[PDB]
Amino acid sequence: NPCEKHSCIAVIDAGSTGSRLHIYSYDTDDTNTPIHIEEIWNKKIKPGFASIQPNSVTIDAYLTMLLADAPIHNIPVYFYATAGMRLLPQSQQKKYYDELDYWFRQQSQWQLVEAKTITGNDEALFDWLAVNYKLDTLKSVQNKSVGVMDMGGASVEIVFPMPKNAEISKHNQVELNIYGQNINLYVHSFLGLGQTEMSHQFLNSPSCFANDYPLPDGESGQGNAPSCKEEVTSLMNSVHKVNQQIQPLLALNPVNEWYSIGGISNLASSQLFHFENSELTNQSLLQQGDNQICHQQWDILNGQYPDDEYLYQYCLLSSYYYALMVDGYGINPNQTIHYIPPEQNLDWTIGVVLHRAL
Amino acid sequence: MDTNPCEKHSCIAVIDAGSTGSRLHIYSYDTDDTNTPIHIEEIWNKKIKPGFASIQPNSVTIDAYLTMLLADAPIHNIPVYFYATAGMRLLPQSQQKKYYDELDYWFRQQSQWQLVEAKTITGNDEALFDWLAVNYKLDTLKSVQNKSVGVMDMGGASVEIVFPMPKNAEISKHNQVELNIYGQNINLYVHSFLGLGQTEMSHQFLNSPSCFANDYPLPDGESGQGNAPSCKEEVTSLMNSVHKVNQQIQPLLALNPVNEWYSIGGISNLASSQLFHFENSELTNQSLLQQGDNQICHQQWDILNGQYPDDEYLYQYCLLSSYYYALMVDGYGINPNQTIHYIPPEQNLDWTIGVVLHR
């Protein structure tokens, strides 16, 4: 039991597609800041918490499946929900939390500290802290700028260093002091631009699916990734104004190394795609989606990869990630984007260990 | 209505499995000289939430869902059509198939309901049923019509539009349907826009302060600062820059004017709110947008919320007023002063009578 000799907390990432419990052990330095953070347990369940019916029976079944088999309990729990809950008004979210609070009050294995929906900006801060914790770039002043993108199912987050600025909304800027270093970040989350929510606007776009893929409207796919990418960009920019918000800031505050977490890791590591060194470029992701999915005959390709239930969307996703990173954020198509191997189950929850405010 | 109407008339069950919920209807009818239904009467209705597509597809959850939908119906030994719409269209076929395999098995394990079909219908079929159902209720199907009747179905995940249009070999055969009913030949244009339903579309504007009442708490922690003209222009970008609604629809309506517009779906719920002032179950887009702007967008959220404790969807009314105008006016090109009839929401009117007529 590592929790006998080290501080332990549980952090739950309640994401739009699933919930992930992590138990972390850690020590603290001279300032009571965590160090030597180690994940001692994880459990992932689907579907997303916001997708279940908020009643006592269903909430119990879900929380039991997430938590009951954990080898360690009697520890503090932070239950932080993200874009899945943000899609609901507070009045509806409150029913989930009233039931979840009751569930925790009716048991003794877990000590609930907080259960709340965090903002996308809070999520983006955690994303940057988690990745930079893993990269060991927090202990000393970096002479490289590290930017983080979290490519979620309902929202996407972008976060990078930016000096404090009186012109930009306070909500989009965070100052923290960690390991005696003062860090100032720009944060932004785009609700609705996660892969699931985005996709619901393009299901009848023939350019976004393999040839003869059966579109729900009865037309056939006729894949073409550059054309699909142009359609997605209209959502990124004409609707959400991603380019106008993000590009001038990155021009002034270049990022030297980009890391991406979230579902893009699963796409990049899938059997259809081929990348070395756990990194990609937008140019190569768009070309590979174009040639290996968009330009293929759907029934033939589906039958080649029988077990693969994400495949059908890869023409669209490859196009969308390019639209978002290149046409939205302004990233060069040849710029390396590091992605974290999915096997690491790396989400933003280490950021909560490091940073207990919101 | 007779006691035990199904002992005296033909009966069928039609289930609208919509994105927000499923509605069972049982209709009695007689048939005329060609075995075509007449005197269609709803004898039972049950609506359950949430949508079929939102459940986890396994035998336990499907059993519980269909039991909740069907078990207390007053008659079970009748044909059943289970037609899902945009909620299921959001899913790939492989994912949909898990639902239908479980549903089929459930029907085969019981011996009363007579399952005829359980499938996802296209938005084009849905729009055909929308037009048949509304025109059946208006009694415009028997005889050739003076005026063109158009129907809009303002759903949670998709919206449908349908109106008379002579055959055009230059338009996809999927967007056209010829029918012969009660001895008359009718040609319709049909179209559905997936993702432009109220729920799906709203997920692109939740952090737009122009689309919410003043001081409404947006998810990103900023405050509402409502302005319906502003929010309408945001929504029009999704309609047109993204979906090309105007390019698709406007050239056809210009050339095939609709004399009378009817809307069904969730729009009747908005228009019925005590915040609005409409007469004769009809609205105009201009009046909808101005009233949303003044009564919701530019009002204080906490005030509004305490004042209308019976409007569950109140928080969305600024956005929905703006959205309806963007879709109908900037998308379809309908004049903002053109009357739009809405069917009183107590009528629970959906497209399902269309299936009684069309099968």
Ligand SMILES: Nc1ncnc2c1ncn2[C@@H]1O[C@H](COP(=O)(O)OP(=O)(O)NP(=O)(O)O)[C@@H](O)[C@H]1O
């Ligand atoms: N095995 C897989 N292969 C390919 N793609 C996958 C796989 N598993 C998950 N994904 C994709 O990743 C998406 C989920 O990404 P993820 O970053 O976990 O989102 P989330 O945290 O649940 N949503 P959000 O609340 O917006 O952060 C899913 O919708 C899938 O599309």
Ligand SMILES: Nc1ncnc2c1ncn2[C@@H]1O[C@H](COP(=O)(O)OP(=O)(O)NP(=O)(O)O)[C@@H](O)[C@H]1O
């Ligand atoms: N009582 C009500 N008051 C106000 N708004 C309501 C009310 N009931 C439903 N609505 C709105 O109408 C929506 C449901 O519209 P509806 O026509 O039932 O869509 P659907 O058929 O479930 N989806 P689709 O598959 O796209 O047709 C809900 O999401 C609400 O936002």
Ligand SMILES: [Cl-]
């Ligand atoms: Cl469709």
Ligand SMILES: [Cl-]
């Ligand atoms: Cl947010």
Ligand SMILES: [Mg+2]
């Ligand atoms: Mg228990």
Ligand SMILES: [Mg+2]
């Ligand atoms: Mg996430």
Ligand SMILES: [Mg+2]
């Ligand atoms: Mg959804």
Ligand SMILES: [Mg+2]
């Ligand atoms: Mg490989």
Ligand SMILES: [Mg+2]
């Ligand atoms: Mg509907």
